[PDB]
Design a protein around this nucleic acid. Structure first.
Ligand SMILES: [Zn+2]
Ligand SMILES: [Zn+2]
Ligand SMILES: [Zn+2]
Ligand SMILES: [Zn+2]
Lengths: 124, 212, 81, 332, 836, 36, 41, 65, 90
RNA sequence: CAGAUACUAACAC
RNA sequence: AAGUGUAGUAUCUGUUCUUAUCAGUUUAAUAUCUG
């Protein structure tokens, strides 16, 4: 008694959101509506993959973890004492990394894939 | 200028640019949270203060290098390609139907005045420097534990009612300092490396710069 | 398995071996909210016994700060039974 | 970037107001909730003018207030229901000019939640127990007493939960020194969730239910329940013992009804309407709030309708039985 | 087999070189149970799955005809019986009504287990009979068990009654009450009435406070038995009332009104074990009463109880003491009446050496006398006891010492007069010196009496110190161990200003004892020194701290637990408070010894050791100690490695994480699974410990966590998830949403993980993130999977949603997406769309 | 076993693709964004 | 060998079968084995 | 599972929304300001707004499917 | 009733090199009849020994009590025998 | 489905 | 010569099944199981 994909595609405001498995839901019309909502996050793509998550990430040599530049410039990477510089690294030099926006999930291939502001702090 | 900020009843803030020559209204940014907006104040060319039906204030800001000069297009998360970032969240406790950036006293500093449905009037005021901010943050942290809310609700949880509290210190909690028994004032001021008169002075000094 | 019945006025206790431990998550860090237990758990021969393991009880049991922040202190009697 | 919040003018609206000798002195005071703020008011009976003694930001939602007094005591406690998951008892201290938290009993998770108690709050008129209840399912009963040092002491909660059941309102019933009783306007939604015709939803009757706390057996029994002809919006405790015939007054659309357990007939009186009313004739009328005034000889209720009109309500008795309700228009 | 004699040939082979000698369905169930009793765990699970469905094709008859002989097998292990019981419950559930023709056969096989003293066998027996009483209707249980209510054997009546109490533990009290209301009045046989009354007694014993809403009904079932001509029924009705009263405590007095007058009439009339049962009943009832009743009825008791003190019967002797305890422990009873009427006959009869000769009477009288003191006051009771500290019998001296111990440990010394101190201290000194055996009661009592008197002990201290110093100079290992323990216990009083000088001698004596041949004694030596360094300052202590550290270093290596636990405390105390008095070189040497003690089996030693690595870091700086700890990550032993991760976090807490974090990050670069996991585990503990400070370090560690989350290895992901959770819970209310949101992108893909530890960690991270980034985000992640076609996706998503819902039900109201209206259903929340 | 694993026992049809039969769940899903 | 390799976690991978080896020992066992021969053939 | 409001794989549209609506009306009854908002918008007495919300609790979305 | 790792054979380490047969029997024999004692007498084995009790319950006793045991300037390390560690040098 | 190995839970002794 | 047990994962090794043409049990789909 299910819709065809063809049928469901015409019954909804956003056909592009419809996938092949959607018509097999308990409520496909609710499911597609929910997928269309502002700021909702997709289900992780690998739910239907036979291999377990991240398990195909094999057979590739990767370099060791790249330290952030403020820690790197502390020189401890070469040491393996200067506690003032060690403080300044975290409390002066610490710069925020390239943080990802809401909803942009990770997966195996992702890695290799007057203008003045109000209420700003005064300079020290 | 050419910017238009639209409050949606539920989908919070949408930034629209009017283009004269093309004669077009283009959406160029939106929020990443539902907000049941009741009122809005523009703080600066990139920043909006919002109130919602659920007693919250927020401040949303366009991140730097946001571009306003804009079936193959889908946008991001079923909304606009660029996202405003919530730089402030605070559960006021009462529904706010007005916000206004204004100076309440002559020669005083500018503040964000807000009115509530319950007839309450208050302000949000920017700290000018680290030292001040850090001091009232430490005051708030000590008062949260040493002078807990009367009817047994966690203060941080209350200010984080619908969204986690972000970049607001509750001065209504800080001014509880003056109501405490003197032993507790002594304990808290010792923790602050101050004496109680200096704490009360700092409390009065902020509340006297922006608005009586 | 936690009792999870309505917490009473009775206060939870810890044996020497299980002391410092948060009942819910075994952390030794920042005891915060005093544990309360249901009457049936405090009753008769069970008076003053350890919430975690039923030992003689020498100290007051606490939920840690994290459990307090998460409102895990609210679930009801945490005697493991 | 970084903001500091200050109140300039505190909330002036009132959601709850309660009466007592909060100072313990013979002078009467009013504790009012302004939602986010608790406040104590003294009306000066000489000037006829109201002074704020004390205001406190409570940093939560006050969902209910009651005054109560232990038997033989002279000072009223404030018991607060809130979005905190805990029943809090306060004593006002005149010397320090502050509310002092006497007890804080925790039972649930914070927020204004459907199944966590806090919305309704009812006291034994003799102070011996307090019931705190949610809109759905959970009701908890705390027994109150004093120690050998005359400090207030509180029991473990006794539960009185009922699945699928809405509560419209709860009040304590004045039964004198008999076992404490709470009356609830209840409705069971189970059948309404199970019938796809909608028949059950329309055929569902609100019930008046009397929960007795057995002090000797330390449990709450759902002793009596009866369906109501129309839905009540709230209850009024009628004075009992030697002060009246006890029972309860259900305020409902277009009516006020007196009910008591035992051989008492239901007495029902329609709410009088304004002559030549310009309102829509389809609108029913509810009482929106009430007050009770007691005196050595007699008592009466003031109940206000939606239109602002206050009725003085009085009950006529033969022996223990109420025989009629009498309404007199009082003022608007 | 393990103690079988060994040939020299067996023995010689144990040793390396270089040592000098100085129908078809029945067959199916068989092959199934064989693979539950024996075989591998998946084979047990498969066979249990097969048999529990196949019970529908077997039916109850053939199934229990095979299972009951197997359950009766005389060599069946507790765990193999427990597995057979987990089969029994599940087949009873699967059979339902099909059990009914076989209830009798199943029951008579299990009835002995309801009496068997081994707790496990007896709770398993209660469980399977509860499951039987769910699968069988109550009418079937009654129809099975009704004949044996009148069995001639008391053991059958006893098990029948116990089985009916198990029936009552599932089928409610109201259900069996009418059957009991018939049985207890069944005139034909007193043994039926007796068994009914005994069911109520066993119901009371089993159910405890759950009796109370049915208590009146249960009393009214028994009440006439107290008035009956059958002395057995009078006796056992009183025992049933005692059991109901006991289970009702402290409530329910109004239920017993009907039986009080029958009890009082019986109290005046009866003798022997009959009277003992009535006295037990009244004894359990008096604590329920208000003060006026309590006084009157206590006074009614004493007109008989004081006579019964004369009784030679051990059961009466137990009961009369228990009744004294119950009366005198009841709140309302006048203490003057106790002092004047209870004490003289009680002391005259029971406080004699003869009562010490049996452990049962001993414990009873000790407890009863403590309970008399608990209401009369300490000194009145102690002054009656104290002379017997100087009586000849060791066992009696031990009895009075234990009594004084238990009185003064509860009530304190404030009641005691000066002369009574002299009498106490003289008697205690005699008792402690003139013991032929080492006894803990004497160590306890002496320490307790001293610690309770406190500052008052000042005149006696020179005599006490000389006595314990003398006993510590005795050759005997056990004697010196006893003396050194007493020093450890009494140290709290030695804080008195003059007594530091006396303690100075003890310190230098104990220093010589550091070569103790016996480890057990050495443990007490160290436990004394532990107390001493806690009382006097490091400089104040007579042995130099600088000299002490080298002496304690070999002791640290000592393998014995007693030595190990005590040594690490002493060293740890020195590291924490007296850090200055030692060289960096010595402290660093200690760190290496500590590396070894992370292999200790007891967690208490490991916990203390981890603290010490940290204390040393405060003193000598973090860099050096961190380097040693990072090297220890290479060790294969997880419990050692895990303990080292804790130490790294402690060091980072003590010396700010800015000092420790760069080295930790570097070690992550090291290409070993264990090190990279140790680094992540240290970051988990560190964010747990630092709380608010985490905001300063969140951005630095975010890339490392992102790398671990992206890692193929499950443990890296699991450990990174733990970090996430703790760091999110610590940074709540301090901004930093951006980093937590970014990490949520890495964590969320792991929701489909099936590994129990990894899924628990991911769930824990999500709960933490709900507080930190808000329920709104969590809901946004869960929306698309709630109504996803695959059940697997829905199961996980609803589990996450439920956690958010329980955690933040109120908050979610604002966050729920707009659901458009259906033809027959309205889903739009119109009020929230109102504009003002 | 790999034949059944890769779902090659199924055989989907696409008219827009001139009635080509991909023979695979994954094959089919990829084809919509490919040349035919 | 041109297929045997060390991963960043101290374990070993075979490049010709993407197989994971806890130890250098396991790799050689995988080398004397079905998948492993089929790849070479 | 024991907590009223929790869902699982077989939760229908109707069940979930009835949860949202009953939970919303309880939030409205507790949040005095949100109740204020509705009372002013409807030009209605608070007592009547609460009563109307309690009435709506019984079947907030129309009958089950 | 005792765990699986307990055994009549007690491997000993940190043993003084000068220790005599009589002293060994003295120390170990306190806990009950000694079956035999074997003392390491090569560069690789000196300072170790295996002590064998007749009865397992005596051996548990000795093992519980003698680890950390002070003889001379040393503290003995006493372990129950494990074959697979006993032949580790092979 | 069995064996070998590695690992997790401040798991326990 | 710092051992053993409990609960749970992961990875190599050696096993991983030709079918017509439909139905059913199932699953998101396949596979599995039964005609
Ligand atoms: Zn314990
Ligand atoms: Zn915890
Ligand atoms: Zn195609
Ligand atoms: Zn290969």
């Amino acid at each position: 008694n299910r819709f065809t994909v063809a049928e469901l595609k015409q019954l909804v405001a956003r056909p592009d959101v419809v996938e092949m498995h959607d018509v097999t839901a308990q409520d496909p019309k609710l499911l597609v509506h929910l997928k269309a909502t502002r700021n909702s996050v997709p289900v992780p793509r690998h739910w239907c993959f036979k291999r377990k998550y991240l398990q195909g990430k094999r057979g590739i040599e990767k370099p060791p973890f790249e330290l952030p530049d403020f820690i790197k410039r502390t020189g401890i990477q070469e040491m393996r004492i200067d506690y003032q510089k060690l403080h300044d690294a975290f409390f002066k030099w610490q710069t925020k990394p390239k943080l990802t926006i809401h909803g942009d999930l990770y997966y195996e291939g992702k890695e290799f894939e007057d203008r003045t502001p109000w209420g700003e702090l005064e300079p020290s | 200028g050419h910017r238009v900020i639209v409050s949606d009843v539920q989908e919070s803030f949408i930034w629209v640019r009017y283009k004269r020559n093309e004669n077009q209204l283009i959406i160029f940014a939106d929020d990443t949270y539902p907000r049941w907006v009741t009122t809005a104040s523009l703080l600066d060319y990139d920043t909006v203060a919002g109130a919602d039906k659920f007693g919250n204030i927020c401040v949303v800001r366009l991140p730097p290098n946001t571009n306003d000069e804009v079936l193959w297009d889908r946008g991001l998360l079923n909304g606009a390609s660029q996202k405003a970032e919530v730089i402030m969240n605070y559960h006021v406790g009462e529904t706010v139907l007005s916000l206004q950036k204004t100076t309440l006293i002559p020669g005083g500093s500018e503040s964000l005045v807000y009115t509530t449905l319950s007839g309450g009037i208050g302000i949000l005021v920017p700290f000018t420097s680290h030292e001040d901010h850090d001091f009232f943050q430490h005051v708030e942290m000590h008062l949260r534990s040493e002078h807990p809310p009367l009817c047994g609700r966690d203060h941080l949880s209350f200010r984080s009612y619908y969204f986690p509290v972000k970049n607001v210190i509750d001065g209504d909690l800080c001014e509880q300092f003056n109501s405490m028994e003197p032993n507790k004032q002594k304990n808290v001021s010792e923790e602050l490396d101050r004496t109680p008169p200096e704490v009360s002075k700092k409390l009065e000094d902020i509340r006297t710069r922006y608005a009586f | 398995i936690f009792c999870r019945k309505q917490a009473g006025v009775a206060i939870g206790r810890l044996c020497e071996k299980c002391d410092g431990k948060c009942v819910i998550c075994d952390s030794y860090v920042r005891p915060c909210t005093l544990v309360r237990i249901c009457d049936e758990c405090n009753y008769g021969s069970y008076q003053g016994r350890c919430v975690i393991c039923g030992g003689p009880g020498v100290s007051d049991a606490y939920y840690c700060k994290e459990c307090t922040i998460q409102e895990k202190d609210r679930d009801g009697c945490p005697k493991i039974v | 970037m970084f903001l500091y919040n200050l109140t300039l003018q505190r909330a002036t609206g009132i959601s709850f107001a309660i009466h007592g000798n909060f100072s313990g002195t013979k002078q009467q005071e009013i504790v009012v909730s302004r939602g986010k703020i608790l406040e104590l008011l003294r009306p000066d009976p000489n000037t006829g003018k109201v002074h704020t003694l004390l205001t406190v930001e409570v940093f939560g939602v006050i969902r209910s207030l009651m005054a109560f007094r232990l038997t033989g005591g002279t000072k009223d406690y404030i018991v607060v229901g809130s979005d905190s998951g805990r029943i809090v008892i306060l004593e006002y201290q005149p010397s320090k000019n502050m509310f002092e938290k006497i007890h804080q009993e925790t039972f649930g998770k914070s927020g204004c939640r459907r199944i966590v108690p806090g919305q309704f709050l009812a006291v034994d008129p003799k102070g011996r127990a307090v019931m705190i209840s949610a809109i759905e399912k959970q009701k908890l009963v705390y027994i109150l007493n004093r120690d050998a040092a005359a400090r207030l002491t509180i029991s473990s909660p006794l539960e009185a939960h009922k699945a699928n059941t809405l509560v419209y309102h709860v009040v304590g019933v004045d039964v004198g020194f008999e076992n404490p009783m709470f009356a609830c306007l209840e409705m069971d939604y189970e059948e309404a969730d199970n019938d796809p015709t909608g028949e059950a939803a329309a055929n569902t009757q609100q019930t008046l239910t009397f929960y007795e706390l057995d002090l000797g057996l330390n449990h709450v029994v759902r002793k009596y329940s009866e369906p109501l002809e129309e839905h009540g919006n709230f209850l009024i405790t009628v004075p009992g013992g030697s002060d009246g015939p006890s029972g309860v007054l259900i305020c409902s659309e277009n009516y006020i009804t007196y009910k008591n357990f035992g051989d008492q007939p239901d007495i029902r009186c329609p709410i009088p309407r304004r002559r030549n009313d310009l309102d829509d004739p389809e609108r029913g009328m509810i009482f929106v709030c009430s007050a009770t005034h007691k005196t050595k000889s007699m008592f009466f209720f003031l109940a206000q309708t939606e239109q602002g009109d206050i009725f003085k309500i009085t009950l006529e008795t033969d022996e223990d039985m109420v025989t009629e309700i009498r309404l007199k228009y009082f003022d608007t | 087999e393990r103690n079988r004699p060994l040939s020299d040939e067996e023995l010689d082979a144990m040793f390396p070189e270089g040592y000098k000698v100085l129908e078809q369905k029945e067959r199916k169930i068989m092959k199934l149970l064989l693979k539950i009793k024996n075989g591998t765990p998946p084979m047990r699970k498969a066979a249990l799955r097969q048999i529990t469905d196949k019970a529908r094709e077997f039916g109850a008859g053939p199934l229990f005809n095979q299972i009951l002989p197997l359950l009766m097998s005389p060599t069946l292990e507790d765990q193999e019986r427990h597995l057979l019981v987990k089969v029994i419950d599940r087949i009873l559930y699967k059979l339902d009504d099909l059990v009914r023709p076989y209830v009798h056969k199943i029951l008579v096989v299990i009835e002995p287990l309801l009496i068997d003293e081994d707790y496990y066998a007896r709770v398993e027996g209660r469980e399977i009979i509860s499951n039987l009483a769910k699968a069988a209707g109550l009418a079937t249980m009654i129809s099975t068990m009704r004949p044996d209510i009148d069995n001639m054997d008391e053991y059958v009546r006893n098990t029948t009654a116990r089985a009916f109490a198990v029936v009552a533990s599932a089928l409610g009290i109201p259900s069996l009450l009418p059957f009991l209301k018939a049985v207890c009045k069944s005139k034909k046989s007193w043994q039926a009435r007796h068994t009914g009354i005994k069911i109520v007694q066993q119901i009371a014993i089993l159910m405890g406070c759950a009796i109370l809403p049915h208590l009146r009904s249960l009393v009214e079932i028994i009440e006439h038995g107290l008035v009956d001509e059958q002395q057995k029924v009078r006796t056992i009705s009183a025992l049933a009332i005692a059991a109901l009263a006991e289970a009702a405590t402290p409530y329910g007095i109004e239920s017993f009104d009907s039986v009080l007058k029958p009890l009082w009439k019986g109290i005046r009339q009866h003798r022997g074990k009959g009277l003992a049962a009535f006295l037990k009943a009244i004894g359990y009832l008096i604590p329920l009463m208000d003060a006026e009743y309590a006084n009157y009825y206590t006074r009614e008791v004493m007109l008989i109880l004081i006579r019964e003190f004369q009784s030679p019967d051990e059961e009466m002797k137990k009961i009369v003491l228990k009744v004294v305890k119950q009366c005198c422990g009841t709140d309302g009873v006048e203490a003057n009446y106790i002092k004047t009427e209870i004490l003289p006959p009680f002391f005259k009869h029971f406080w004699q050496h003869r009562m010490a000769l049996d452990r049962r009477n001993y414990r009873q009288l000790v407890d009863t006398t403590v309970e008399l003191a608990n209401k009369v006051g300490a000194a009145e009771i102690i002054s009656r006891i104290v002379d017997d500290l100087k009586d000849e019998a060791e066992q009696y001296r031990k009895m009075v010492m234990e009594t004084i111990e238990k009185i003064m440990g509860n009530l304190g010394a404030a009641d005691i007069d000066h002369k009574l101190e002299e009498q106490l201290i003289d008697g205690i000194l005699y008792a402690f010196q003139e013991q032929t055996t080492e006894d803990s009661v004497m160590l306890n009592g002496f320490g307790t009496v001293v610690n309770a008197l406190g500052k008052r002990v000042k005149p006696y201290l020179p005599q006490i110190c000389g006595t314990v110093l003398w006993r510590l100079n005795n050759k005997s290992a056990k004697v010196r161990q006893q003396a050194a323990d007493l020093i450890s216990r009494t140290a709290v009083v030695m804080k008195t200003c003059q007594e530091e000088k006396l303690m100075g001698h003890l310190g230098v004596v104990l220093y010589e004892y550091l070569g103790e041949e016996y480890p057990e004694v050495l443990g007490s030596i160290l436990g004394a020194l532990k107390a001493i360094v806690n009382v006097i300052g490091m400089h104040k202590m007579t042995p130099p701290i600088k000299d002490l550290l080298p002496r304690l270093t070999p002791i640290l290596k000592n393998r014995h637990e007693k030595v190990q636990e005590n040594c690490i405390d002493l060293v740890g105390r020195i590291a924490d408070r007296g850090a200055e008095y030692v060289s960096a070189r010595e402290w660093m040497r200690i760190c290496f010894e500590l590396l070894e003690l992370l292999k200790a089996h007891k967690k208490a030693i490991r916990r203390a050791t981890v603290n010490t690595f940290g204390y040393i870091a405060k003193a000598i700086g973090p860099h050096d100690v961190l380097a040693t700890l990072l090297n220890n990550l290479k060790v294969q032993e997880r419990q050692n490695r895990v303990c080292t991760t804790v130490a790294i976090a402690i060091v980072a807490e003590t010396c700010s994480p800015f000092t420790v974090l760069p080295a930790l990050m570097n070690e992550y670069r090291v290409p070993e699974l264990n090190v990279q996991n140790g680094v992540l585990k240290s970051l988990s503990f560190l964010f747990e410990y630092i709380g608010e400070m985490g905001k300063d370090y969140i951005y630095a560690v975010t890339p490392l966590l992102e790398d671990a989350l992206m890692d193929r290895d499950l443990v890296h992901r699991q450990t990174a998830s733990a970090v996430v959770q703790h760091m999110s819970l610590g940074v709540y209310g301090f901004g930093c949403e951006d980093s937590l949101n970014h990490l949520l992108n890495y964590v969320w893909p792991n929701v489909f993980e099936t590994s129990p530890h990894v899924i628990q960690a991911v769930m824990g991270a999500l709960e933490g993130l709900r507080v930190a980034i808000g329920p709104c985000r969590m809901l946004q992640y869960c929306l698309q999977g709630l109504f996803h076609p695959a059940r697997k996706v829905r199961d996980v998503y609803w589990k996450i949603y439920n956690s958010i819902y329980i955690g933040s039900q109120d908050a979610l109201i604002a966050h729920y997406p707009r659901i458009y209206n259906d033809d027959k259903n309205t889903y739009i929340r119109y009020e929230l769309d109102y504009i003002l | 076993w790999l034949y059944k694993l890769h779902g090659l026992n199924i055989n989907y049809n696409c008219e827009i693709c001139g009635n080509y039969t991909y023979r695979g769940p994954k094959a089919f899903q990829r084809h919509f964004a490919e040349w035919r | 060998d041109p297929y045997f390799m060390k991963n960043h976690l101290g374990s070993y991978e075979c490049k010709l079968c993407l197989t994971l080896h806890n130890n250098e020992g396991s790799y050689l066992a995988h080398t004397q084995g079905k998948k492993h021969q089929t790849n070479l053939a | 599972s024991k907590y009223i409001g929790t869902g699982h794989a077989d939760t229908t549209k109707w069940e979930w929304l009835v949860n949202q609506h009953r939970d919303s009306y309880c939030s409205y009854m507790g949040h005095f300001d949100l109740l204020n908002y509705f009372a002013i918008a409807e030009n209605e007495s608070k007592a009547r707004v609460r009563f109307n919300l309690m009435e709506k609790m019984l079947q907030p979305c129309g009958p089950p499917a | 009733r005792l765990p699986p790792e307990v055994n009549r054979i007690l491997y000993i380490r940190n043993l003084p090199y000068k220790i005599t047969a009589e002293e060994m029997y003295d120390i170990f024999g306190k806990y009950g009849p000694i079956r035999q004692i074997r003392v390491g007498n090569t560069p690789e084995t000196r300072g170790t020994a295996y002590v064998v009790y007749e009865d397992i319950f005596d051996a548990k006793n000795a093992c519980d009590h003698l680890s950390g045991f002070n003889v001379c300037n040393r503290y003995l390390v006493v372990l129950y025998y494990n074959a697979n560690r006993a032949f580790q040098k092979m």
